[PDB]
Design a protein around this nucleic acid. Sequence first.
RNA 1: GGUACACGAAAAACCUUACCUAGACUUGACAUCCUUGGCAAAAUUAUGGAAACAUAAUGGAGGUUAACCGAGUGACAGGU
RNA 2: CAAACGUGCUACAAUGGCCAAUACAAACAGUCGCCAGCUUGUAAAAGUGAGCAAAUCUGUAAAGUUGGUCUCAGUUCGGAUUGAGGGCUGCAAUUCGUCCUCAUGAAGUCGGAAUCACUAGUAAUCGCGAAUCAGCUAUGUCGCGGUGAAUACGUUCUCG
Lengths: 104, 48, 86, 60, 123, 129, 155
Amino acid sequence: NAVKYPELKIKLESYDSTLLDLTTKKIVEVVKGVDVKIKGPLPLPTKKEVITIIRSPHVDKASREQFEKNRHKRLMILVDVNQGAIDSLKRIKIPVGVTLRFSK
Amino acid sequence: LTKQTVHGRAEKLSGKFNAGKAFLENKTPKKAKGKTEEYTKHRSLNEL
Amino acid sequence: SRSAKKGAFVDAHLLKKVIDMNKQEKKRPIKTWSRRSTIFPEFVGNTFAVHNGKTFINVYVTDDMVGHKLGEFSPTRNFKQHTANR
Amino acid sequence: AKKSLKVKQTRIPKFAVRAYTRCQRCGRARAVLSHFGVCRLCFRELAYAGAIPGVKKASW
Amino acid sequence: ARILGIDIPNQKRIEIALTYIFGIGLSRSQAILKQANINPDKRVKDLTEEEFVAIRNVASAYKIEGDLRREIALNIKHLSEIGAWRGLRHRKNLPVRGQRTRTNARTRKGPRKTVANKKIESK
Amino acid sequence: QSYYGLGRRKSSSAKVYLTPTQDKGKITVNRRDPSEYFPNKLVIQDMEQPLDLTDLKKNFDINVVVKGGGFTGQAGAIRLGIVRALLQFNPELKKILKSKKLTTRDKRVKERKKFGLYGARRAPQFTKR
Amino acid sequence: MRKNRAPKRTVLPDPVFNNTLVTRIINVIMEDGKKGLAQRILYGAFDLIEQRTKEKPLTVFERAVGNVMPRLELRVRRIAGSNYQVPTEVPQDRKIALALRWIAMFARKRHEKTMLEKIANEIIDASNNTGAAIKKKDDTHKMAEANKAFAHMRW
RNA sequence: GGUACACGAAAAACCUUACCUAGACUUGACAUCCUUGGCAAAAUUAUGGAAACAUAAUGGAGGUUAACCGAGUGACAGGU
RNA sequence: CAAACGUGCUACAAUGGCCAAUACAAACAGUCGCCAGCUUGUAAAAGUGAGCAAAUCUGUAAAGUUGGUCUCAGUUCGGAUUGAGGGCUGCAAUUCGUCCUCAUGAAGUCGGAAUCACUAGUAAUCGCGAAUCAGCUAUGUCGCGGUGAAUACGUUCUCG
Ligand SMILES: [Mg+2]
Ligand SMILES: [Mg+2]
Ligand SMILES: [Mg+2]
Ligand SMILES: [Mg+2]
Ligand SMILES: [Mg+2]
Ligand SMILES: [Mg+2]
Ligand SMILES: [Mg+2]
Ligand SMILES: [Mg+2]
Ligand SMILES: [Mg+2]
Ligand SMILES: [Mg+2]
Ligand SMILES: [Mg+2]
Ligand SMILES: [Mg+2]
Ligand SMILES: [Mg+2]
Ligand SMILES: [Mg+2]
Ligand SMILES: [Mg+2]
Ligand SMILES: [Mg+2]
Ligand SMILES: [Mg+2]
Ligand SMILES: [Zn+2]
């Protein structure tokens, strides 16, 4: 038995919310199918960006619509991984939208 | 009764022109565009 | 205003012509488009033709005009009298 | 006179301060979003089609 | 009072009394006050000759208040005797820096001399 | 047997710890003297408004933790917090406290600025011409 | 054209003298959205009232404000030329409101020194029926007495 | 007019810029289609230059022409 | 630029000016950036230089409380205008950048006829952040929070 990686801090963030929740359920199921003690799926504050754009083409600055872009964020810290988990981590297939911030 | 003159400018500003001529003759084409570098990626599953 | 370390500023094209023109005795008004060049002490005694936007106005530099910018002693626009609207 | 400014924008200038940001779809110079490189009225058309993931209308 | 031809108010503190002089403002007055070591909050009427000599010497060391007026006058004459575009702009009683002159900048143009706006019978 | 209450007002949390004691209440806010936490502009009474008309002789030592807001908003948070801790000691007190409406979240928060408007509800000056 | 009657916010009992009316006048002298400042100014005037009149400040304040308080209100009603007025009995809530509004307006115009002493003099000056607020109340009352005839027709 | 006037313009020193004065160019700064080759454009250093642009230089990633670099070439490109 | 109008900012002040100490936010933004601390400088800033790809590091909260002073003056109000010396960005700040320091101290003591907005965290007010941006008298615009009111009897008149 070995570890080769103490304190694997996986970080997740994506523009969409529901897929992000789906990715957390899939990641957790595989890592508990192997022998690892997950600390917990904590939520992080969502970075929201807002852009204001005038609706009209030429005049009337007053009529301006709004748009938003939410950066939903999650955290995941792995205690001990071992080969049993890393090889199974290769078959995860994360839906494009979710972005991983693996920090080793 | 007159204390000669204590004005005339020139002298003080003259050093400023001397500084400027030295800079212009020093001028080295150190054209560049940037600062911090590297640490630019989006990560993966470390091998997918 | 303008920093110290930087100093003054000439485009250095004006500098090359002025050194050549000061050595040459039979000086004639110098045609410069550089309104950005500050008047340097060595410039004294020469005459320049600054581009006001339309023509080249002739300026005779003295021992006093040293320090300002070469375009400051020429105009760009002209206004001398309005006209009754009604 | 649109294309030449568009073409000139792609070409590198001789001074760093000579570089401005133009819309990449049209050639409009003012009101360009550096976060997306797209002007306000192309961003509206593009946002109303779903090309930018996550740009939803805002209700606060 | 007694400081040169200026008559600083007698019932007013000294650090404001120096401001009342033309060539000395407020910041330099504190500089004179601190350099001479004379303590503020001492009404000028309740002061002695010993302080009145130190302040006059340092005031004399700085630029005389009467000479600044001639200093401003020569600078305008120096700028106008140069033929500068800023000087011409200073010449016709207009903002010398970059202030706009379309609808504002009346502090240099005095009172308003209302003329007659154009006649619009409609088109 | 301590009791805990969590009040809020203008985005300001509150952690009030109600401890039974018989040696004077000793009002305390965030480990500091009330006389030092507030501009003492007579705001101290407000929080005690439900603790006065009922009683303060039971000398409950209060351990308040408030993090956020200004000072009236923080004050608004703890008044609600004391009442929420008060709903665990003698549920009868609730009835009389309910009457005066001292057991309801104020629901009053600052509105969002709107585009084309100089504020939440302001609007630019209109011109007949 | 509305058919709805507006609600009313609580007035709050005062925090010192337990006399509601103090909170209303505090809000009246409010400027710049300063709750603190207004309280300080007003409460400071009571300390001066103690120092000057040697009596209870709440008693002097009620005697001044209740006395300045008017009875008749003249409502403007134009038909063809100028306006013929109509005297009506004001409700009690509005009755108190004009007195406080009036007390502050004449306080911020006196030739006196810091408005602390200014407002203190106005309140002490209205307890003896000789001031600026009295004249205003007298003037509106005399207009109503003069205009007793048109009281029957209101609208 | 209300429904224009801190409006287009969520940034006019040069650039932006569409304007004026000047110095320069003509299948053109950019594009396709056609006969035809690629053994470059850049960038930068010189001289003349207000800078455009010219005459000289390291002759340049590459991939054998992919993209582009061109010649020839008339349909045309182009117009804020 | 002889002028006129619109929208805002600053004021004409002791509910204030100046000085000292000091408590309490939310949101947002950041690797050609945020820039902590330290050294120099009357200051804008410069040098050194960690930390932070960010619930971690950075972007001083101000009004507010207390103390001292001014004592109602065209002033310790008000800051325009003007002169000089500096700092930053940028090839380049004269036409035409802004900041700091020093100097001066216009008008203005509540504004005529007539008009505008607002029904609670609203009107009024105090700061903070972002967008476009090398830099910008944006006092503009878009957002976030701190304090926080008065009044609505009624549809006779007024506009739609
Ligand atoms: Mg076009
Ligand atoms: Mg300007
Ligand atoms: Mg219209
Ligand atoms: Mg130009
Ligand atoms: Mg131009
Ligand atoms: Mg080759
Ligand atoms: Mg070949
Ligand atoms: Mg056309
Ligand atoms: Mg505004
Ligand atoms: Mg004070
Ligand atoms: Mg920490
Ligand atoms: Mg006056
Ligand atoms: Mg002032
Ligand atoms: Mg300048
Ligand atoms: Mg006055
Ligand atoms: Mg309403
Ligand atoms: Mg205001
Ligand atoms: Zn576009």
